[PDB]
Every structure is written in structure tokens, then in C-alpha cells.
């Protein structure tokens, strides 16, 4: 007739209805598995807890007036907490008495929970919601929306459930809500486990909001743990700063002190988004978005701003009433609302999404490469050289010519390096600017380019690693627009696809051969947003960062020599493996190859398919012979982008027994002795399972 709770591998809790009788709350809910079969045997002695809160309209008296704060969750269960253990030698703390909302455990009431034997249950709260005054007062209103929450922790799973309803009417639809964000936006950056918080027993956003209330804080740090403030502060991370009385910028890390005085220092957090002002990463709007998704522009909260900017966001700030000056209805002189000012930041990047390069007159003059190039805005109009950016003296807006782009791009040797195939628009030796057409003419004559003997049949590419200058928002600045580069401007890379074709000697109309699918760049962009690190015209890093690219010195690494390949840069990046980095939440784990690599509709990681480029030879350093230049076969070198440092003898023999090379003197040497059969066993599916997926 049903299935026992202590045996079921899946569980779904659903509230059906709720009732309030003179402060007495009774909720009704059902338990079911994935198939929908009733789950029986839930007792009070299971890790079963319940919360109850009101969505209360809040006004705040700020001086001689009241400001609307919208609706805030107020739990009926709160406790007053004096600070427990506070660690010493830890800065940025201010221990003080704080309130904390809580749930009530069912095991405290012998007659509160009823099993109906059919998969449905009824729970009567131990708290009376009619007159809660201490330690935190909640003025009950039957017209106000109430939220019941339940959390359940079993051996095999943890479950949450919530229920919003209006007591006066019994409506669950068409009532005041505070549905702002969705867990799906969080999952764009977060491993689901990294958001299974506390015991791993708290999963749903609605549960978070029910307990992380505006009146709650951490006693041992003195920090607010209000849902909005906390999440903002956390993600501002190491970029959270403030200004003292002298007007100097000082770090303001958000720290939470917990059990035994342990320190979670969110100053260690590095938010991956560039720029970091795009609210939409969490505040998603559109079809299927939460009802109140536009609350981040309602301008009803100062705490919300303070979460990221603190109370002194500049040397010139003195008042803390953020909404008095930063709003849309009646802004302060010289400034604007958050939406507008944050909008100013985004403007340059949003514009650059419509910026592209137009190539023309491609050919050969005196056995040298030549071509014309224009840089277009989002009106399809050319921009002057004054707007073209040179970010540094070593990083310049340049055009990069590539060949063998369907394989692994040109080899890193004299004449075919990124620096040999690149041409800066500001370098008069190779670049000439026509002012009447706003067009650059490039000639490879005065360079170190070693063009292949015959380009016929080759899949070539012209890549525009180009950025454009824009002004910044600020006092009295109404609009952010393209601005000739200066000491006060900022740059943003243009965003287009590299121009690719098959060389025939006559035209650029013949399509080029496609390279294998390796990574899904939309995944890259999901976490990083507009740009990643440098040369951020899309994700075309593999044009410079080749498998045979020169070794780099890293004194913290065995042999003091590390590769510089694209795969290495991504596989080795600290933020891609947050197990012992950051706050160790495992938010990003490189072990999950589907984080970056291409996967089909059936969730098969096709991007890590082996043996698709047998002719490839990687460049590594021998961790024994002081980072001595060695050469590694195709599939092995892909594995050694993570496995090199702690590599065992048996593992080495495993490579070699199966056709692998780990001691080449050259690439040709490798191709001679290489005969890999790795794709027979190490398949995409078994590689995922081997890494814990
Ligand atoms: C009440 C039953 C809560 C629920 C539901 C959620 N949180 Fe929680 N959280 C709660 C308290 C009382 C505290 C203070 C702990 C302290 O040391 O003072 C916290 C703390 C956090 C933190 C800080 C770091 C940490 O404790 O590890 C975070 C990041 C946090 N809470 C997140 C969080 C999330 C995402 C929740 C929904 C899944 C959530 N909390 C629910 C109380 C309660
Ligand atoms: C994910 C890391 C977020 C980023 C990026 C931004 N916000 Fe946010 N915001 C986040 C959460 C979890 C919440 C609470 C949702 C809830 O159910 O309560 C919020 C809420 C806000 C609010 C509303 C505050 C209130 O009315 O009480 C505002 C005004 C707000 N956030 C502003 C804001 C802005 C301007 C952002 C871009 C700079 C931004 N947020 C980013 C999580 C995240
Ligand atoms: C974290 C998700 C934030 C929230 C919440 C708020 N702001 Fe913000 N702001 C954030 C970033 C990453 C930046 C870019 C500057 C930086 O610190 O890196 C900003 C910037 C501003 C600015 C200046 C705009 C500019 O051109 O630099 C203003 C005036 C501003 N922010 C105001 C503001 C207000 C009023 C907020 C509450 C509604 C608010 N911010 C929240 C990150 C975050
Ligand atoms: C009127 C007295 C204001 C109050 C109250 C707050 N802000 Fe402000 N802010 C104000 C002006 C005139 C300016 C300069 C114009 C501009 O848009 O930059 C600012 C600027 C900021 C900034 C950006 C500063 C910088 O990037 O160097 C931020 C991040 C900011 N304001 C945030 C902020 C917060 C969090 C506030 C509440 C504590 C707040 N402002 C109040 C005017 C006024
Ligand atoms: C979320 C699961 C991510 C995906 C998908 C990608 N990256 Fe990432 N990356 C992420 C984080 C949290 C960080 C740390 C940010 C920091 O400032 O330290 C990073 C970091 C990088 C870096 C270094 C950035 C820097 O030094 O400024 C690089 C070069 C990088 N990531 C590359 C990269 C590429 C090419 C990706 C697509 C295959 C990609 N990342 C995806 C989180 C996430
Ligand atoms: C040629 C114009 C390049 C493009 C396109 C990309 N990178 Fe790069 N990068 C290049 C050089 C010559 C160097 C210095 C030596 C080295 O190989 O390390 C770098 C450096 C990096 C680094 C480390 C240094 C740093 O700034 O953090 C990283 C993490 C890196 N490169 C990653 C990276 C990514 C993600 C790219 C696509 C957006 C990318 N590079 C493109 C040359 C070139
Ligand atoms: C990419 C831009 C992210 C988005 C979208 C969200 N989060 Fe995030 N979060 C991100 C990083 C890089 C980190 C640091 C992780 C580390 O281990 O260093 C975090 C951290 C958190 C935490 C703290 C977890 C812990 O202390 O154990 C929480 C509670 C958290 N993030 C919550 C959260 C929510 C609710 C989001 C949706 C509104 C969300 N994050 C989105 C990066 C990103
Ligand atoms: C994002 C941080 C990644 C994670 C997570 C994983 N990989 Fe990756 N890998 C990444 C990049 C940017 C590249 C190079 C892309 C390019 O254009 O050259 C790679 C490369 C590989 C390859 C080579 C595939 C081929 O040549 O056809 C393999 C086989 C590979 N990576 C394996 C792999 C595994 C097993 C992972 C889980 C442990 C994994 N990758 C995660 C970026 C990222
Ligand atoms: C960085 C993204 C990696 C790439 C590329 C490859 N591997 Fe990996 N692997 C990586 C880590 C951090 C770990 C440890 C896992 C853990 O939970 O601690 C592993 C582990 C394995 C294992 C299992 C080892 C064990 O003792 O059980 C296997 C069998 C394995 N890796 C194989 C493998 C192969 C064949 C790869 C090239 C195709 C490869 N990995 C790439 C990180 C990374
Ligand atoms: C079937 C006979 C396989 C062939 C062909 C290849 N691999 Fe393998 N690999 C296989 C198993 C059953 C295991 C785990 C047990 C073991 O004997 O190691 C592995 C392990 C690896 C590892 C992980 C080593 C470690 O984490 O210490 C790596 C890095 C690895 N294998 C690489 C590799 C390469 C490059 C291959 C093609 C030349 C290859 N393997 C083939 C099964 C089989
Ligand atoms: Ca605490
Ligand atoms: Ca965790």
C-alpha cells in the first residue's frame, strides 16, 4: 500500500493546507517517493523540524520620516544569543548580543505530529503565533502572508518544504510574496552540494529566507546574517572594502564565527564575474522568473547596498541612508539609483557585445601576409584609432593570424608563435591607419612571421584581440559612451567570432574545417560573465596557449617549471577547485568535467573524448631533472595537466604500457614512439565515474 520512510531512497514533502486557531498553527502535508507512492512511518523522533514566519510590511523611521522597507520575513521562533567562543588574533569582528531565528524540533512534543497512515501527516506547532513579544516581537496579522517551513534529515536524503498562505482567506495564489531569486541561477556557479548548507539538511531558498531574517545576526562576529545582506557580503568576497575617518580604503571582510570559534572568512572568496556589478547573475528576470524578481530595483533597502559596499562606500560619504540619495524617483544631485549607476558599469561591456572586426583585402604581398581591418561599433560604424586600447605595454590590441585551426593551432616555434603571428594596430612597423576610411592596413614584412610554404588547403583564422575605450560613471556623468583612450578611461574587449576560411589563393568564401568539440564556452561565460582574464574577445585562448607552448617558472612546483597550455591554465586555476581553496565549499570542482567540457543531450561528456588528436605533442617539465624540457603524447599530456605532480611509478607504467610517451626529446620523437589506445578503456563515461560523478 506504501513504502517505509526508513527504506525509501527518494522523498518529496508537500504542504496541502494550514490553519490558525487563536495562535495555534496546524499544517497538513504529504510524503511521497519519485514514483508518487505514499511514504509511511514518519515520527517525531526523526530529525524533523518546523518553522513559522510572517511576511510583515516594515516601515523604518530614519530621522524625522518613515521609509518603506517592503515586506520582511519575521520568524515567530527567535532566541537571544550572547557571544560564545571568540577566537583571538582575528580582525574585523565585533562580538555582541544578537537574535537568531530558529525552527522547532518535533521531538519536543509527544502529541504534535500525527501519522494518518495513508502518506499524509498533520503537525500542530508548539509556538503560539498570536502574541510573540520576546525576545523578538512579531505582530500577527491574518491578512499578512505566513510561511510554514519543514526540514527533514534521513540516513539517505534530506528534504525541505514550504507553504505560503493568507490566513484570513486561505489563498495560496494572488497574495503578497517575496519570491526574488531561484536556486537555478545559483546552480550556474554552484555544485548543488555546495549549497546544501549546515548539516547538508537545508536545501531550498524559501527555507533560507525563513530563518535568515532582518533581525538576525552572528553574536561572535556582530555581523547580520539576514539573507540579502549575507549573500551579498559573501559574494563581494575579498573585494569588500570600506573607508576610515582619514579616507583611506581598508579591507572589510565579512566573517562568520561558528562552532568552537571556527572562522569562515569570506575575504577569501573570489567572485568569478567580470565585471562584478551584473546583478542579473542572481536576480534573473523574464519568463518563468520569480514573481518578485524585480525587487532589487524597488529601492526599499539600505542593508542590501551595505551588504556589498558597507556604510562608508567612499571617502566622501557621511550619511548611511542609501535610499535617500540613490533612487529613481528623486535622485541626489550628481548621482543616481543603483540600477543606473551599476548600469553605467555594465554599459561598456553591453555595448562591446555588438562590437566586431571587418577584414578585407586579405592576400600576399612579396611573400608577406597583408590585410585590411576595421573595428565596428554596435551601429556597424568604424571607430577611430583613438578608441583602440593598449591595456599594457606587453598587451596590445592586435590581430592574430592562425593556421591548422582544426587541429591544435600553429606550433610554438620560431616564426609560428603567438608573438610571431600577431600584429598590433598601434605598431607602425606592421600597421598603417587610413583616417579617411578608419581602416588599418597590416603588413607582415617587418615582423618575425614565418608563413608556411603553401597555405593552400589550410584552415586559417584572423583573430581580433582588440579592446575599445569607454568612460566611467561618476559625479555628474549622465551617459557612459565610447571615449578616446586616456588615463581616466577603461577598456573592454570586442565580442565577435574569429574570421575563418580555407585558403585557396583567390577568395575567403570557402569554409574552414571545424576543430573537435572540447569545451562549451557558454559554461565559461556562465561563471565569468563578460571577460575572463585577458584578450577576452570571446573564448579563443587556444590560439596562443598551445600544447607545445614554452614552459613557465613556478617555484612552488616540483622542478620549478610549469606548462602554459590552454588545458593547463583551466585545469590548474585555483578557483576551479574549491576544495582546499576559498572557503572550501566545493562550489567549483574540476573533478566534474562537465563543468567546462562539452556534453550531449544524453549528458555524455563528448568534450573529453580521447584520441581525437594523435599528432599532438605536449610540452612539460621533468619534475625530477629540475623541470627539464620533456615531451608527452596526446592523451597522456591531457591527463598530466592535473596528474603530473602526484604521479606514481605504477601510473607511469600504465601510460607507457598502453602507448604513452613521457620522456620525448622532441615532438617528432614522440609521434615516432607514440601509439596510444587510451580511448578503449578511458571513455568519457568511465572518466566521469573515475572522478566521482
Ligand atoms: C534556521 C533553521 C536556518 C536555516 C533554515 C538556514 N540558516 Fe544558515 N544560519 C542560521 C544561523 C542561526 C546561522 C549563524 C551561525 C553562527 O555561527 O553564528 C547561520 C549561518 C549561515 C552561514 C554562515 C556560515 C556558516 O555557518 O557556515 C551561511 C553561509 C548560511 N547560514 C547559509 C544558509 C543557506 C544557503 C540556507 C538555505 C539552504 C540557510 N543558511 C538556511 C540559521 C539558518
Ligand atoms: C547572488 C550572489 C546575488 C547577487 C549577484 C546580487 N544579489 Fe541581491 N539578493 C540576493 C539574495 C539571496 C537576496 C534575498 C532574496 C530574498 O528572498 O530575500 C537579494 C536581495 C536583494 C534586494 C532586496 C532587499 C530588500 O528589499 O530587502 C536588493 C535591493 C538587492 N538584492 C540588490 C542587489 C543589486 C543592486 C545587485 C547588483 C549589484 C545584487 N543585488 C546582486 C543575491 C544576490
Ligand atoms: C553586490 C552584489 C552589490 C550590491 C548588493 C550592491 N552593489 Fe553597487 N557595486 C557593486 C560592484 C561590484 C560595483 C563596481 C565597483 C566595484 O566595487 O568594483 C558597484 C558599484 C556601485 C556604484 C558606482 C558605479 C560605478 O560606476 O563604479 C554605485 C553608485 C553603487 N554601486 C550603488 C549601489 C547601491 C545604491 C546599492 C543598493 C541598492 C548597491 N550598489 C548594491 C556591487 C554591489
Ligand atoms: C547623499 C548624501 C548620499 C548618501 C546618503 C549615499 N550616497 Fe552614495 N554617492 C552619493 C554621491 C553624490 C556619489 C558620487 C556620484 C556617483 O554616482 O559616484 C555617490 C557614490 C557612491 C558610490 C561609488 C563611489 C565610488 O565608486 O568611488 C557608491 C558605491 C555608493 N555611493 C554607495 C552608497 C551606499 C552603500 C550608501 C549607504 C551607506 C550611500 N551610497 C549613501 C550620494 C550619497
Ligand atoms: C563555474 C563553475 C566556472 C566555470 C564554468 C568556469 N570558471 Fe573559470 N573560474 C571560476 C572561479 C570561481 C574562478 C576564481 C576567480 C578569481 O578571481 O580567482 C575562476 C578563475 C579562472 C581563471 C583565473 C582568473 C584570473 O586570474 O583573473 C581563468 C584563467 C579561468 N577561470 C578560465 C576559465 C575558462 C577558460 C573557462 C571555460 C572553459 C572557465 N574558467 C569556466 C569559475 C568558473
Ligand atoms: C595571445 C594574444 C593570448 C591569448 C589569446 C590568451 N593568452 Fe593567456 N597569456 C598569454 C601569454 C603570452 C601569457 C604569459 C605567459 C603564460 O603563458 O603564462 C599569458 C598568461 C595567462 C595566464 C597567467 C597570467 C595571468 O594573467 O593570470 C592565464 C591564467 C591565462 N593566460 C589564461 C588565458 C585565458 C583563459 C585565455 C582566454 C580568455 C587566454 N589566456 C588567452 C597569451 C595569450
Ligand atoms: C557565480 C557568479 C555564483 C553565483 C551565480 C552564485 N554564487 Fe554563491 N559563491 C560563488 C563563489 C565563487 C563562492 C566561494 C566558494 C568558496 O568555496 O570559496 C560562493 C559562495 C557561496 C556561499 C558560501 C558557502 C559556504 O560558506 O560553504 C553561499 C551560502 C552562496 N555562495 C550562496 C549563493 C546563492 C544563494 C546563490 C543564488 C542567489 C549564489 N550563491 C549564486 C559564486 C556564485
Ligand atoms: C574548466 C575549468 C575545465 C574543467 C572542469 C575540466 N576541463 Fe578539461 N579542458 C579545459 C580546457 C579549457 C581545455 C583545452 C581546450 C582547448 O581548446 O584546447 C581542456 C582540455 C582537456 C582535454 C583535451 C581534449 C582534446 O584534446 O580533445 C581533455 C581530455 C580533458 N581536458 C580532460 C578533462 C577531465 C578528465 C576533466 C575532469 C577531471 C576535465 N577535463 C575538467 C577545461 C576544463
Ligand atoms: C584536472 C581537471 C584533471 C584532469 C585533466 C584529469 N584528472 Fe584524473 N583526477 C583529478 C583529481 C583532482 C583526482 C582525485 C580525485 C579525488 O576524489 O581525490 C583524480 C583522480 C583520478 C582517478 C581515480 C584515482 C583513484 O585513486 O581512484 C583516475 C582513474 C583518473 N583520475 C584518471 C584520469 C585520466 C585517465 C585522465 C586523462 C584522460 C585524467 N584523470 C585527467 C584531476 C584530473
Ligand atoms: C584498459 C586496459 C585501460 C587502458 C587501455 C588505459 N587505461 Fe588508464 N586506467 C585503467 C584502469 C583500470 C585504471 C585504475 C587502476 C590502475 O591500474 O591505475 C587506470 C588508471 C589511470 C590513471 C590514474 C593513475 C592515478 O590516478 O594514479 C591514469 C592517469 C591513466 N590511467 C592514464 C592512461 C592513459 C594516458 C592511457 C592511454 C595511453 C590509458 N590510461 C589507457 C584502464 C586503462
Ligand atoms: Ca556563531
Ligand atoms: Ca560545505
Short mmCIF file of C-alpha atoms in Angstrom, two decimals, residues 50 56 61 96 105 112 164 200 206 242 250 331-332 340 352 405 439 473-474 478 481 526 548 573 631 671 674 689:
data_model
loop_
_atom_site.label_atom_id
_atom_site.label_comp_id
_atom_site.label_asym_id
_atom_site.label_seq_id
_atom_site.Cartn_x
_atom_site.Cartn_y
_atom_site.Cartn_z
CA UNK A 50 9.33 23.12 11.58
CA UNK A 56 5.45 41.59 7.52
CA UNK A 61 11.87 55.77 10.98
CA UNK A 96 27.73 41.49 20.63
CA UNK A 105 12.08 20.25 16.76
CA UNK A 112 2.07 17.40 17.84
CA UNK A 164 2.82 30.46 1.85
CA UNK A 200 23.54 19.50 4.36
CA UNK A 206 12.49 29.51 0.90
CA UNK A 242 35.48 50.45 3.27
CA UNK A 250 40.69 49.39 4.09
CA UNK A 331 17.93 61.19 -7.01
CA UNK A 332 20.60 63.20 -5.19
CA UNK A 340 21.56 53.44 -13.25
CA UNK A 352 31.09 45.73 -26.69
CA UNK A 405 42.95 25.76 -36.56
CA UNK A 439 40.84 51.32 -41.67
CA UNK A 473 30.30 56.61 -14.43
CA UNK A 474 30.58 59.14 -11.61
CA UNK A 478 24.89 61.20 -17.34
CA UNK A 481 29.84 56.18 -24.09
CA UNK A 526 28.09 31.47 -17.12
CA UNK A 548 53.66 22.94 -27.01
CA UNK A 573 43.30 27.56 -11.92
CA UNK A 631 57.64 15.82 -24.43
CA UNK A 671 54.94 10.77 -32.79
CA UNK A 674 53.56 7.08 -29.62
CA UNK A 689 32.79 7.90 -12.78
#
